[PDB]
Amino acid sequence: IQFGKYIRLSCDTDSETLYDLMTQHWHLKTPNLVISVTGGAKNFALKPRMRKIFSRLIYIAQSKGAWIFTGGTHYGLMKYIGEVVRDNTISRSNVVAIGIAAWGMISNRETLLARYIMDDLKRDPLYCLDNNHTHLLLTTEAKVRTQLEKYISERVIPESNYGGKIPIVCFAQGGGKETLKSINVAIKSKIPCVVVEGSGRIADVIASLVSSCVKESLLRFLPRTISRLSEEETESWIKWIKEVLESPHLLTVIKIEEAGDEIVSNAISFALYKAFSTNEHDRDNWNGQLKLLLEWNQLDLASDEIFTNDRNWESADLQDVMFTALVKDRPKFVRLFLENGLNLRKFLTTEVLRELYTNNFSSLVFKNLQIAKNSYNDALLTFVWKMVEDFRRGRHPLQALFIWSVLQNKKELSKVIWEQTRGCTLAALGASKLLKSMAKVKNDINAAGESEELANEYETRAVELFTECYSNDEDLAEQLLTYSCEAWGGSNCLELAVEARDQQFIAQPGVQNFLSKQWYGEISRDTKNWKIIMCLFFFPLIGCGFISFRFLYYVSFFTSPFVVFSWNVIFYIAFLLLFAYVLLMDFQKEPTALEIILYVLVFVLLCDEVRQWYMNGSKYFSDLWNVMDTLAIFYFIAGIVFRLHSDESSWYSGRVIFCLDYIVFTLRLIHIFTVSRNLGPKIIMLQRMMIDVFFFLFLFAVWMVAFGVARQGILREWIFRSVIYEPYLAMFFPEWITIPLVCIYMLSTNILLVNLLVAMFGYTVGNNDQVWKFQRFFLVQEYCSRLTIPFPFVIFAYIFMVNEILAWEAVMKENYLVKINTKANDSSEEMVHRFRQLDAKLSDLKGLLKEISSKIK
Amino acid sequence: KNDINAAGESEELANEYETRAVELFTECYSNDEDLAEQLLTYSCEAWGGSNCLELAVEARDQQFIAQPGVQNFLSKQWYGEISRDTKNWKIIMCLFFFPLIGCGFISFRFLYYVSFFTSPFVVFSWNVIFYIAFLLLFAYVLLMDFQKEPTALEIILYVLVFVLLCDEVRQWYMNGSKYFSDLWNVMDTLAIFYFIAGIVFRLHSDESSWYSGRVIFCLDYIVFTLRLIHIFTVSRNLGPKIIMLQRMMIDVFFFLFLFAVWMVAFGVARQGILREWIFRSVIY
Amino acid sequence: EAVMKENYLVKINTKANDSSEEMVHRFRQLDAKLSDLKGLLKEISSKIK
Amino acid sequence: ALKPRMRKIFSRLIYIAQSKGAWIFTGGTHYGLMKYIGEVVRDNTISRS
Ligand SMILES: CC(C)CCC[C@@H](C)[C@H]1CC[C@H]2[C@@H]3CC=C4C[C@@H](OC(=O)CCC(=O)O)CC[C@]4(C)[C@H]3CC[C@]12C
Ligand SMILES: CC(C)CCC[C@@H](C)[C@H]1CC[C@H]2[C@@H]3CC=C4C[C@@H](OC(=O)CCC(=O)O)CC[C@]4(C)[C@H]3CC[C@]12C
Ligand SMILES: FC(F)(F)c1ccccc1-c1cc(C(F)(F)F)c2[nH]c(C3=NOC4(CCCCC4)C3)nc2c1
Ligand SMILES: FC(F)(F)c1ccccc1-c1cc(C(F)(F)F)c2[nH]c(C3=NOC4(CCCCC4)C3)nc2c1
Ligand SMILES: CCCCCCCCCCC
Ligand SMILES: CCCCCCCCCCC
Ligand SMILES: CCCCCCCCCCC
Ligand code: NA
Ligand code: NA
């Protein structure tokens, strides 16, 4: 059909190959089958509540793969049911909406792509077919429908998730004789369950009953119906409601009090559970009721009615029930199976994990791994992309599952498996490092936008766990920082927080105190600053009772990074005073013995820095001031070979290279003074302003070159020696050209002035205690890594080179996990549980008012 | 401003409908990016004859434009058919090296070469590289060449500013006299008009005019470099400093105006204390 | 875009449950439950007198 | 059924038992509560309260 399939049928059709028509020449079979009953009511109060209930129903029908049996006409609900079906195929979350019509009640007919005319819906009582139903089969209709549902309820499937039985549910709302008749043929012919609602005429007369008091409530909800149909038909209606309350287990109500989601999936699953439970051929079966309550998300029904200690499972049979709890993303059920006993390390064999990374790893996330591994590479990503490829080509098993959940952005499933890991403040940072690598991938903003926040949730979990760890024992938490992880990724928690730029983990007072312990070395804090400095100039004051080291005292003093840095600054000044004494009073013609001292004092400055050409990765060359140090030392060695040339034009030029080298050796000392003073909140203002003036001095040099072309082009390989140098030395005819020449200077200034003022203020635009404390931790960490031995005795170390904490961290996790849930009492402060806790207390008053009218009548 | 109460409630109803367009497009972008970006450039069958993207930038709808769906669409537009996540230097090294495009080196998501050289990231990086090579040729001609006649290297410079001229009278379309209130884009015409005025002073055969033709070219070298400095200072401060820039840049144009007004009044006090000549002495 | 509007319009109203968190509907939902107790206390003094 | 509520009640109990210096008489087998009761005891000796 074209406004879709069509089949003409009379009522006495065939023997069940109508279903085999639907599955052999046609679409797939069913794990679920909802039917809808509203009749040909042209009026339908389409409330936004009714819009949610019948949009969740189509969403559930594609979440399970169901058919929907409706009258296939273009009126009200069954028109709206079709529109949510085409809304679902457009949104692409398929769903099959099979329409059941009379063939005698339709408007037009075309017999053979057939064309149908949706002309207009006037006063003619014939019905208009609906345009959005995927299949159409054509109160004539209510036997071929009811015999089909009485077939497929008995159709035994070999898959058999719901005792075989192809789960049927009858979704009912609204009034009319036809919807009250169809609930009867639902319950009484065979027994599929029925769901009713809290709005409608016939829907509320059965919702009120969960006698002639039937008819009392019946004229409450539909009084203008009784005035037309007969009293020999009013007697049948009270009779009809009597055969639906004979089976009160096959009825679930959607009460108006449920003002939220879950409510359509709660009602269908509860109705499917009773029709599984009250069958009683299944009450001994705890396992079929588990997979039924796990395919749906009924956590509370599984906790109350399957794990009771009246049923006796023994938790070793719970293996395949756990695997489907993982791959369907049921985070409440993987938590329920560990709470009721499951050794998750025993369950996670290596072929289960390769069953998870092959079949259950999504190809979109695996596509974003290649855009992460090849474009934004790290030491962790090369480990994890290797670890994914080992499983896909077919030992810490709890972290292979944890990486699997974290990669797929499974937000609540990964937090269940994180509480089972052993190194769990390291798995939280290892997830935060991994997710921040996936958040760099700009192939999808929605995937990267949720891996970015899942990284911030796991950074906050590592903060709150380590704050719990540091508050209990400092010396144990600092062993937990530097734990070498047995190849988690081959990193500490401290390394893995600084690659990820995890500023909240690094700015916390436990980590910042660990670095101050590292920088002071074996010298304690609280001594004083000047108390350590005066022990530098005075050796026997160390052995005196003067510092607090918490001989072996002298080696602990002179290997602390505070002392080594203070020595390397004091020796650098004494190097500069010797470099100034040689350059002025000495330096006659030959390399004097005091200058030979300077030749080895820069060689130990050179070997210290090609040592920093290890731990290198060409990170060192993007530091913008550390490249000055090589080019100060390379300019020194170039000034040595000009000294050993015996020409007075070259010897003097060898001195000039040394005198210009004295400034960059002092500019390094000025740079050391300006960073060590502004270590503190100004280190963000510094080094961002310092790259901002390098851009302004670059643009000033570009303008100074262009000023040279305008200068030399106005006047008369010589050009490079005159277009570059003389504009700086000049800062050391009028045709009418001053009409633009001051407008040159009014445009030269206001592009160099603005670039200067951007440099002063550009640090402000674009948390600033955490932004600082990461960088203060960053800079101090490299010097504590920079060979904490005195500088002239660095060569004597350079050429001489040529799990009970995890048990302790596990008990700190349990104290941390309690402190989350006991703080979620302001969430339980609300009237959620508090509302009908006392309506239970007046139902007890109702339960004792049962006793009163029992004997007064 | 005929009624503040009517205009004060149409202002908030505009902010309610801008927020409705934000939350709907954030719903649209979170479901399918490729469908939401077709929804941006939908030509509306004459709603007003506009996209959602045009209609948000005329209205200065900053909340619709600052959302991550629209900002990602522009970064898709600026990178062109070249994907993101390649690297910055990975695209630059394919400018100097043509066969590195055909190699497995960028990620374009021959037809690869036309998709490379029509992306706005590459065209802008080419137009900066060619602008520097224009300035080095303009410096080589102005110093070593430029003897008396228009040398063949200088004829190259005469057409390289003509393609700079025709590119910009092309920007005298899409124009509305919007282009003339940009305060630095009017420098570019007056750099090119000052160039063409420096051409007709070269073809005059007088040594007082030929030398003055060179002076006009040498003063024109700075505004061609001040444009390059302006290109560098905007492309670096693309980021949160672009509000600090271009508001500070009009603030120094006011200060240099008031400095020039004081420098004129200092000239009257200077020349009035000492002994058509006045305009050549009170200003310069 | 029309089906993305319907998903957006639901997310407005399902987020207006903190507005429905108040005791507006919650106040006499249980006073209805004690009026049912009043409605069955209709039955008691009907026959003691 | 080791609920998180049951986890709090039998972790406070071991915490009370060291806050007072008590003995805890349990069946000494490796099943459920008496397995968990042992684990909070070794959790308490590790945490050293
Ligand atoms: C006349 C000359 C030869 C003798 C003067 C001695 C100073 C040049 C020396 C001795 C004390 C030194 C200072 C000792 C303590 C300070 C603060 C100190 O602060 C920190 O540790 C940074 C805080 C942090 O890392 O978290 C860093 C070294 C510094 C700048 C040192 C810089 C150079 C100083 C001033
Ligand atoms: C010695 C000369 C002849 C060769 C030096 C080459 C540079 C002059 C060229 C090649 C790389 C170019 C850059 C390539 C990438 C950057 C950053 C790029 O950043 C953006 O795309 C802005 C962000 C945004 O629009 O959202 C803008 C172009 C820019 C400044 C280009 C400016 C000029 C550059 C430095
Ligand atoms: F001081 C400082 F920045 F506040 C600082 C403060 C706190 C901790 C460490 C440092 C620091 C940082 C660096 C840098 F980050 F820059 F690498 C340093 N570099 C040197 C040099 N000593 O010899 C050299 C100088 C002479 C030429 C050869 C190399 C380098 N000392 C440093 C101390
Ligand atoms: F670079 C820039 F601003 F950071 C920028 C960054 C990002 C995107 C675009 C631009 C940009 C903006 C403009 C402006 F907004 F100013 F129009 C540009 N104008 C030019 C010129 N090329 O030739 C001309 C120079 C020589 C004289 C004739 C005209 C103009 N390039 C631009 C690039
Ligand atoms: C921040 C304390 C700085 C004290 C410097 C003391 C200098 C001692 C010099 C001894 C010769
Ligand atoms: C050609 C001179 C134009 C006026 C220069 C004033 C600039 C003052 C800058 C102070 C930072
Ligand atoms: C922001 C990345 C800038 C990289 C510039 C690379 C320059 C390549 C020059 C090749 C001759
Ligand atoms: Na200037
Ligand atoms: Na200036």
Tab-separated table of N, CA, C and O and ligand atoms in Angstrom, chain B residues 88-89 92-93 96-97, ligand 7:
chain	number	residue	atom	x	y	z
B	88	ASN	N	48.351	20.421	13.445
B	88	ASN	CA	48.531	21.676	12.728
B	88	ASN	C	49.732	21.603	11.799
B	88	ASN	O	49.637	21.948	10.618
B	89	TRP	N	50.868	21.121	12.313
B	89	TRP	CA	52.083	21.046	11.507
B	89	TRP	C	51.976	19.990	10.416
B	89	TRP	O	52.686	20.064	9.409
B	92	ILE	N	50.656	21.978	7.501
B	92	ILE	CA	51.627	22.960	7.028
B	92	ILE	C	52.713	22.288	6.199
B	92	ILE	O	53.136	22.810	5.161
B	93	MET	N	53.159	21.103	6.619
B	93	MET	CA	54.209	20.423	5.869
B	93	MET	C	53.693	19.837	4.562
B	93	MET	O	54.495	19.471	3.700
B	96	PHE	N	54.283	22.894	1.753
B	96	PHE	CA	55.583	22.930	1.111
B	96	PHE	C	55.890	21.660	0.329
B	96	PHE	O	56.732	21.700	-0.574
B	97	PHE	N	55.195	20.557	0.616
B	97	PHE	CA	55.465	19.248	0.017
B	97	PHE	C	54.165	18.719	-0.581
B	97	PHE	O	53.330	18.159	0.134
E	7	LIG	C1	51.092	25.317	15.205
E	7	LIG	C2	52.039	24.414	14.419
E	7	LIG	C3	53.069	25.266	13.680
E	7	LIG	C4	54.087	24.352	13.005
E	7	LIG	C5	54.847	25.120	11.928
E	7	LIG	C6	55.661	24.134	11.097
E	7	LIG	C7	56.500	24.897	10.076
E	7	LIG	C8	56.945	23.931	8.983
E	7	LIG	C9	57.921	24.638	8.047
E	7	LIG	C10	58.363	23.666	6.956
E	7	LIG	C11	59.364	24.354	6.031
